[PDB]
Amino acid sequence: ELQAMKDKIKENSEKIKVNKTLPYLVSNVIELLDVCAVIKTSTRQTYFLPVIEKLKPGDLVGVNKDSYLILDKQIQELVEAIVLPMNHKEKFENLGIQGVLMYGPPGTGKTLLARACAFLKLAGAKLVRDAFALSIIFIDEVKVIA
Amino acid sequence: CGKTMLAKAVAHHTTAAFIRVVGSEFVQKYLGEGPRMVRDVFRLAKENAPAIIFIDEIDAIATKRFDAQTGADREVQRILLELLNQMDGFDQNVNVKVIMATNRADTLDPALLRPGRLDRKIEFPLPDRRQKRLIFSTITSKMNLSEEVDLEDYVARPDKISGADINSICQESGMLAVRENRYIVLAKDFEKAYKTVIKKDEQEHEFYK
């Protein structure tokens, strides 16, 4: 029967080839439900799909055009608080314990030190959340530094 | 003082159509959407049938029309003017009776207080002694009650208790009894509820007196 199953592999492959006529469309994957998807085509329409599978609610996905299917002390302290937790995470947690704003007059070198440590260098809660979503993070106005 | 409840009454005793809207619903971010919504509401009510538009909370839009020296307040003023014009304008309405409720009738525009648009101006004062007695009877109904209770004392004791807080008195007396493992509330239970609802503020810096 394995030969017949190989022939069915062949029919699956030709099915993929015919249904994958490359000139697709691109659409947002806005919304995501199940009893599926609710795509938003680039041409300002929104279309439900029962059958397309862990696509992000907001990912940009291809779709079928027709069926529509898818300071020595300061540097030492910063080096401590940044690097050492990252390496010896378990060491910090040994006892059962668990934002770091940086100050300095204009041009003191906070950005320079952050770059030297570098990772994300983002320059309000929306920006906060997105930056910590996308790992060292420096937030001028996972490892949090602000 | 039980005006939204009286509106809920109509809607369970009116044969006509009912359209309840919130005074803050008419406001919109886009220019002209508020006036468009007011026109849509009034036209729909006029066309459907004898209708009652309950614009609760009218003070969200109708306030005195001052110069307003800005954009958003002018849009609010346009909402108010559209409401005035639809209630009594060139194209007179028929069988579009309107009810609106507000907690502060002084701030409302003097044009939307004109016999012909608002010809009743009903007041809903805080319950008197007699209304307190009636409210207490109506609430303590459908409720097991102890024989030793004297609602007369609570009714007579002069306070500013409104209908909502009378309901709260009865409700929290009920919950106190439930926690006390008893379905028949005693006078101690009420006395507790009455104190906890009166909530007499104190510590008033005494030199004022």
């Binding site: 697709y24 469309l25 680039s42 055009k65 | -």
Partner: protein
């Protein structure tokens, strides 16, 4: 064109942003080299 999706070595699968109309994906073909065709500049998509 907006991206070449890395060209996936073979099968470049370019992305196009037909203005005021839509964005699509394309193989193009008929040109000399998938890379020297284009990276991020105007191009003429066939109709159908």
């Amino acid at each position: 064109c907006t991206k070449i999706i890395n060209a996936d070595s073979e099968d470049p699968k370019y992305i196009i942003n037909v203005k005021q109309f839509a964005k699509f994906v394309v193989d193009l073909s008929d040109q000399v080299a998938p890379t020297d065709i284009e990276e991020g500049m105007r191009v003429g998509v066939d109709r159908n």
